[PDB]
Design a protein around this ligand. Sequence first.
Ligand SMILES: Nc1ncnc2c1ncn2[C@@H]1O[C@H](COP(=O)(O)OP(=O)(O)O)[C@@H](O)[C@H]1O
Ligand SMILES: Nc1ncnc2c1ncn2[C@@H]1O[C@H](COP(=O)(O)OP(=O)(O)O)[C@@H](O)[C@H]1O
Ligand SMILES: Nc1ncnc2c1ncn2[C@@H]1O[C@H](COP(=O)(O)OP(=O)(O)O)[C@@H](O)[C@H]1O
Ligand SMILES: [Mg+2]
Ligand SMILES: [Mg+2]
Ligand SMILES: [Mg+2]
Lengths: 371, 367, 371
Amino acid sequence: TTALVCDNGSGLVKAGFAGDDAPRAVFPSIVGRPRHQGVMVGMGQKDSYVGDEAQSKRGILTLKYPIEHGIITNWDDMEKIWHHTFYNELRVAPEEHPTLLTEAPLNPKANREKMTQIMFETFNVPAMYVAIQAVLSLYASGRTTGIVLDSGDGVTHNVPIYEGYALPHAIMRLDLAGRDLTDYLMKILTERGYSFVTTAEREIVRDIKEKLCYVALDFENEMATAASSSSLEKSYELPDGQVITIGNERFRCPETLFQPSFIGMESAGIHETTYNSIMKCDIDIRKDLYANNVMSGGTTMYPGIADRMQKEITALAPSTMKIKIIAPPERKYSVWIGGSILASLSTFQQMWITKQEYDEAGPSIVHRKCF
Amino acid sequence: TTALVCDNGSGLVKAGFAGDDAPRAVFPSIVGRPRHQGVMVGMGQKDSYVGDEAQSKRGILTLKYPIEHGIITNWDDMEKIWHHTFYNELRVAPEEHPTLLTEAPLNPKANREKMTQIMFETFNVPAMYVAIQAVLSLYASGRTTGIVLDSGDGVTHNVPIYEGYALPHAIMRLDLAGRDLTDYLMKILTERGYSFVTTAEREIVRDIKEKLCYVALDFENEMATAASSSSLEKSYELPDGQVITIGNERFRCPETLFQPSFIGMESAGIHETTYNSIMKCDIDIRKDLYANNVMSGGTTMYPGIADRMQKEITALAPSTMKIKIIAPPERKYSVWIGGSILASLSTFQQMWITKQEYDEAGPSIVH
Amino acid sequence: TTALVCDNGSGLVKAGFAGDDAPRAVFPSIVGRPRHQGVMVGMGQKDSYVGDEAQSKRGILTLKYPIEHGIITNWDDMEKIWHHTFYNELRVAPEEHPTLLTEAPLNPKANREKMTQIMFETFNVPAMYVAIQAVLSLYASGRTTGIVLDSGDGVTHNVPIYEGYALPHAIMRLDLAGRDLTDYLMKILTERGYSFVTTAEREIVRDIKEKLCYVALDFENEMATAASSSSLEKSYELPDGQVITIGNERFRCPETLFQPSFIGMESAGIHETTYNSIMKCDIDIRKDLYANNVMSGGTTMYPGIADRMQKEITALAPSTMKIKIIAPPERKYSVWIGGSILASLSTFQQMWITKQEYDEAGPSIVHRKCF
Ligand SMILES: Nc1ncnc2c1ncn2[C@@H]1O[C@H](COP(=O)(O)OP(=O)(O)O)[C@@H](O)[C@H]1O
Ligand SMILES: Nc1ncnc2c1ncn2[C@@H]1O[C@H](COP(=O)(O)OP(=O)(O)O)[C@@H](O)[C@H]1O
Ligand SMILES: Nc1ncnc2c1ncn2[C@@H]1O[C@H](COP(=O)(O)OP(=O)(O)O)[C@@H](O)[C@H]1O
Ligand SMILES: [Mg+2]
Ligand SMILES: [Mg+2]
Ligand SMILES: [Mg+2]
């Protein structure tokens, strides 16, 4: 009847119906199991917790992430998360609505093939389609020309599009994302005597990073200010009542996006990646790409990131070139909004991979481009 | 037919049937024998007395305790006490009702193995189970999350439980308990000229401690008040008519719980032990543990103990943390009530260690 | 004149002069005070005992450890231990010899800053340097390439080095060490009816663990053998004449190193940690790291630990990979030997942080990388 849009990013599930203005079920992509000693199921105890269930009881659970760097690694956990999303979060029968899914570019084919097999055999979904997140972000922005930088928990990628035409040769992908930033913050916090080693402690540190971290305009001058002044100090209260104080870490943690060498990787910065992606396109396209820079995803929600990137790109680009950074207040749900818009389109109704098409063509039909 | 619940704490036996609201037989765990000269059994004299029998005739008997620090040391006395409980206190045949027993954590395995062997060979009990006292106390409280401090005659232990899941790494055990407090009171009473050296005198001093001792909110200020004023004096009448007067001893005797160094032990206080047990759990659990502090046992019946411990834990805990101490008026029988509740549950009927299971698996099935 | 090398591990002090073949003063890092009732110092009684002084009189003392998990917590005790080491163990004036110190990686900066402040103000040491223990262990081994696992009383850490270049991103640290093993043995011994609750009893249990514990090649089969046979029983005599018998505890106590869940921690085993550290390095380095596995420290002195770890790593590693475990007979003093070798080098004489450098640059000079 009504198509379902479900964005399966790493660490967060956003699902809803096509035509809606926002996803109606948002919860972490985690599975938790008891860790102290064996659970004896002859009586009233459970062994698995999904989403907010694991978050509420994380003090006695070990938390899983089924998706690593945009690749699903634990498929039983994926099936259980899908079942929970389908029967409790949305409490709707899958067999009567087509489902639209999202994936990162340059992923292995086996991931898409397994997703389609599960979506057609375990659940008898009438039809499905897997799209690229950057295209949906551009759809949500309402533009047809621009280069989109999407950064989440596992993957940061750049996709330039010019007036409805993609540029597959200039698509770049980076493995640095929010999870690596959380790990770096956990490592750095040991300098002040704060130790976080468990998965629940990792969730606490992720909350701290979301709440207190920000992007500095100039890193060295900001570091000098933090070394000579204490105006940058912030306080945070732990769940058990302890209070910790954080200083230059607040802007040191997100600095890894522009300086990947902080965690030992040889890659370039996100601004450098965007400039290299733009330079790989034809010379008659670069001006429009400079004029339309779009970010989306949770990792782009740091305060001051847009100004910093505009400064960096202006430094890289020629002086006569005109540049903005487009950072809407709802960058978090841009992929889902674009997916809903696309699923609501009449021209997309021919793109669905139905039951008989998959049954006859086989698994190879996933990489088809109908358009 | 109906399961039997029997809490074998040190110095007190509480037994009854599952589903009942209170134990129906409560008596001291003591065995007494004549002490003056040899009992010649050719005619009408007895040599052993159990429970209230020894208490009534303690003036001509030497009293035993078969259980020391939660460990059974004299097994023949244990068998005789079990036989008396089974045939005179409850006057019921053991071979037709399953029996639920209790034990302190971190006990030797041989104790449980010997208990099971006696409960299966000497008495042909159809099935049995040995549980932890703190879990039964939490069952009686009706909660699934909390940390329980149980203090009796021999053992004080802490067991934190979060929503039906135990935390074995944070279980702490202390050997300071009511018997040590009685010994300390007996030692301290010599300052005023009162001498108690026999077992019956020890029982008298235990009665005095139960009747007159209390926990002070602030020890030094209370001591200053007792030194400068006589409003804290109390009078007690001995069985032979002598009257004794006791002063600061009334709050000095239970102070050993918070200050173990009074009797020469290196351990920390009960509040310090509880705080250390809470700090050993995961950070996402500590708030609920702070909100649910439960005491049970006879040694927690001193007036003012709950306020003192709440003050101490509030001093130890952060200011934003919310704390109560849960001290029901019937903390004495919490373990037995929880055992009865558990034995009445339908999900517990699969937990019984039956005749053939023990006969085949062997002694290792107890754990 | 001659540089001093002092390895301040938890629970043991090893000090000596550079160029020597072994440390000349080895004693526990403990401070003892009387515990029964107040010491009245108007006449001939003492209140503090250091090292073997506390060990000989531990029956009337409560013993301190100033260092917890490689972090100094009681600084007055640290000053007294340093003074004893400097004036009675070595009976040498500090103000004429430079001192080389050791520290665990990923420690708080305040620890090093306080150590330097005490070493420069309380004692007027001409110069000092703080090194990493794993680097000194590799120096003692004589190699330039390899991954070192150092386990002591408080900290177990892994540091991979390839031909003189460190890999800071692959350094891992674990808090499980010998003290936790002693606590676990004390807890487990209650099953047989043996109770140890005081600090002196803890020292006795530590001696028992050092004397009778060993690492089993296969845990379950060894447990079955111990359950079905009594050939694994051992006898130990207490100081007061009591004799105790210990069975499967002898290999259950050190099993916590490979199974941290025995004490309720979520961490992986030491073999798993080493494999994860190796896998984090570049693919062209892993073969040499597999070929050079070095242990050092007291906690690596259990019999059969090297064979067990080689078996585990061979199980984890591919079949074509070549692996040894390097376990010299003197793993206990490897850090001190490497420190002496480094202090004897001519290229290290430029690394000393002298009086005026610290007076001018300030406390921030401790983390400098001169090299
Ligand atoms: N306000 C914020 N500040 C910093 N980081 C954020 C913020 N909100 C979300 N994040 C980070 O974004 C990451 C991923 O979120 P998102 O990209 O929206 O979903 P997904 O990656 O699952 O598609 C999270 O790991 C989170 O740490
Ligand atoms: N009102 C009271 N005040 C102080 N102490 C008490 C009181 N009632 C009981 N006790 C002490 O509690 C101790 C043990 O009682 P309890 O814990 O109920 O049984 P058990 O230890 O046998 O399981 C006794 O030694 C007694 O001295
Ligand atoms: N032969 C041995 N067997 C088992 N453990 C040992 C042995 N020798 C020393 N240890 C343990 O090693 C721990 C720390 O020793 P070490 O690492 O040499 O010094 P430090 O940790 O002070 O630098 C001690 O707690 C001790 O229990
Ligand atoms: Mg996303
Ligand atoms: Mg009791
Ligand atoms: Mg060491």
